[PDB]
């Protein structure tokens, strides 16, 4: 069995083992990696997104496994494309983060598993400082990738 907490901890330390029994779990319960219960109820963060924050050397293969699991249930598209819902990071997707981190490899990977390239990150974190701040590029992956000189 797996609750939200269980996976998020596994992800935090790049553990691909504690997620050995993962796929077969939501096969029995037919639960989806995308269920309401597998996201933070106030931000909309998913395990993939936790993984995106918990990088070590711009690397995490909990990602590769996490994606793999989502296709086997074909949560695939809406999984890779889930966005933040809090006023701060609203509309931020994993692809936004990969770029923010200047990580070709993870941009490449996300685009190949079908990240929406037109997804607008539009929360207060992506507009001019309250100061909050900060910082605006606006919104769309291309725009980001240019404004950060990439």
């Amino acid at each position: 069995l797996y609750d939200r907490r269980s996976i998020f901890d596994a992800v935090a330390q790049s553990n691909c083992q504690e997620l050995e029994s993962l796929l077969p779990f939501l096969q029995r319960s037919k639960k989806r990696l995308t269920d309401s219960e597998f996201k933070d109820p106030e931000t909309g963060k998913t395990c993939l997104l936790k993984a995106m924050l918990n990088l070590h050397n711009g690397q995490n293969d909990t990602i590769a496994l996490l994606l793999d699991v989502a296709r086997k249930t074909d949560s695939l598209k809406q999984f890779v494309n889930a966005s933040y819902t809090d006023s701060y990071y609203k509309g931020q997707t994993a692809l936004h983060i990969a770029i923010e981190r200047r990580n070709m490899t993870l941009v490449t990977l996300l685009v190949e598993n079908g990240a929406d390239v037109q997804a607008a990150a539009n929360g207060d974190f992506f507009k001019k400082t309250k100061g909050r701040p900060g910082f605006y590029f606006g919104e769309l992956p291309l725009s980001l990738a240019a404004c950060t000189n990439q």
Binding site: T129, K130, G131, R132, P133, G134, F135, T148
Partner: protein, 148 residues
């Protein structure tokens, strides 16, 4: 911060200026005024005080030149004046502007932070001098420079 700069400068000049300058002007005016009192026998311009006051007006912009008819030796008193009038307001004035100009090469730029100190002291005191009433007591600055 516009008003403040103006406020600081006047106070600084006043502290600097009177000792270096108020005294020197007093000496030039004192000497010449004494020279004049000796010069005049009668008519109330004999008094050091009346004569000195008459001598001051030259500096104000109200100078009367040869105000007094009374006295002896004719024009020498006028030459005595022309020098003092030429000598003190005017010889004295040029060097006085010049030092400020030389600083005004500089301090004006250094100073503005000087006001900054004044606000800090006023603020620090009110809270301390505000009864140490409940008041804030985390700092962070929103930042965004790349550098990326």
């Amino acid at each position: 911060q516009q008003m403040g700069i103006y406020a600081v400068m006047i106070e600084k000049m006043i502290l600097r200026d009177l000792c270096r300058f108020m005294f020197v002007y007093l000496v030039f005016l004192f000497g010449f005024s004494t020279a004049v009192v000796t010069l005049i026998e009668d008519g109330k311009y004999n008094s050091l005080y009346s004569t000195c006051l008459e001598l001051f007006k030259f500096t104000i912009g109200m100078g009367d030149l040869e105000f007094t008819e009374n006295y002896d030796f004719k024009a020498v008193f006028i030459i005595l004046l022309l020098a003092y009038v030429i000598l003190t307001y005017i010889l004295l004035l040029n060097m006085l502007i010049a030092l400020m100009g030389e600083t005004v090469n500089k301090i004006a730029q250094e100073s503005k932070n000087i006001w900054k100190l004044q606000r800090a002291i006023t603020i620090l005191d009110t809270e301390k001098s505000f009864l140490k009433c409940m008041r804030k007591a985390x700092x962070x600055x929103x930042x965004x420079x790349x550098x990326x």
